[PDB]
């Protein structure tokens, strides 16, 4: 009824605990009101719209799990994000991406070398500095900031069989950016458990020692699961 309307904006809170308890309450009374016929209260109060909103792009296991349980109890379907299919791109999409991020002054060079999505996702600093013309380290740092923002929000489904992206995202959302370096080199979820650090450094292109160490321990812990 009208009491439920007070619990409708609380979810917009900045802190975690408010969101957690709001989701626990709504999901619990959804489970209560689910067996009877009255499920139409969620329709006309418009809480379903906020739930269908917040489930996508959320890295919070408790609230997202509760929202999924609430939606699947009402017989609806959970949404999923619509991410760019970066590793199957051509030069036109690369150039419009360069228009979008603001590096429009380099669109000529990226056209002459015919850089596409597979070549975009495997760029290093030598290709940037020597032949693409980004001389200043500040500009390369800005470019890599934008690139690593893109790489965490791509769609690797056309090339990732073993679903490595979710395994990397479960550790830390910042880690998903490495998935293409693990797949093009050949790895997968089954044979991951016996890689060395020195192979992670130059083949998979992981540079931060902390990320190498966390990935190594988390992989090596999943030692002989099959």
């Amino acid at each position: 009824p009208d009491d439920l309307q007070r619990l409708v904006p609380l979810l917009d809170s900045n802190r975690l605990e408010a969101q957690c308890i709001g989701a626990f309450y709504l999901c619990a009374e959804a489970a209560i009101k689910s067996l009877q016929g009255k499920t139409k209260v969620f329709s006309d109060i418009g809480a379903i719209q906020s739930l269908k909103r917040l489930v996508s792009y959320s890295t919070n296991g408790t609230k997202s799990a509760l929202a999924k349980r609430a939606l699947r109890l009402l017989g609806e379907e959970v949404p999923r994000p619509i991410l760019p299919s970066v590793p199957s791109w051509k030069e036109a999409e690369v150039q419009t991406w360069l228009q979008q991020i603001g590096f429009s002054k380099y669109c000529e060079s990226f056209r002459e070398q015919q850089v596409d999505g597979d070549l975009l996702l495997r760029l290093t600093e030598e290709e940037l500095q020597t032949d693409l013309g980004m001389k200043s380290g500040i500009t390369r740092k800005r470019f890599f900031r934008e690139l690593t923002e893109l790489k965490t929000f791509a769609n690797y489904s056309t090339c990732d069989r073993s679903n490595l992206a979710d395994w990397l995202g479960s550790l830390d959302p910042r880690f998903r950016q490495y998935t293409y370096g693990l797949v093009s080199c050949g790895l997968d979820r089954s044979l991951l458990h016996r890689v060395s650090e020195q192979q992670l450094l130059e083949d998979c292109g992981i540079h931060l020692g902390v990320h190498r160490a966390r990935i190594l321990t988390a992989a090596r812990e999943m030692l002989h699961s099959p």
């Epitope: 996508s56 949404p79 994000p81 619509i82 991410l83 760019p84 299919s85 999409e93």
Partner: nanobody, 113 residues
């Protein structure tokens, strides 16, 4: 699966004066990562005029800062562009853009008597 975008608005106005363009999609906008508006003048190539992400952070080029404004509307799946103070050189065909790949068809916009 392939999202379809349709624009609306356009036409012609006088120098000085506002207009609002609308772009409607086939799915929920709140699932799409980025959406953007693009502008192609006759005799030149395309360029960006506004972008907006899933969390509602927007970037504008320096050319049109303060004069344009992009917003999502979650009631009906539609992204709006608001053009407040117009110049004579702001006449072109405008396109709506989903993530990167998918385009719209465009709407012509002209500014004169």
């Amino acid at each position: 699966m392939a999202v379809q975008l349709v624009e609306s608005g356009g036409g012609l106005v006088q120098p000085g004066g506002s207009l609002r363009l609308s772009c409607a999609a086939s799915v929920s906008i709140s699932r799409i990562y980025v959406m953007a508006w693009y502008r192609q003048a006759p005799g030149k190539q395309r360029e960006v005029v506004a972008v907006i992400r899933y969390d509602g952070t927007t970037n504008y080029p320096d050319s049109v800062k303060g004069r344009f404004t992009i917003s999502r509307d979650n009631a009906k799946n539609t992204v709006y562009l608001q053009m407040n103070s117009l110049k004579p050189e702001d006449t072109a065909v405008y396109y709506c853009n989903a993530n990167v790949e998918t385009w719209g068809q465009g709407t012509q916009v002209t500014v004169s008597s």
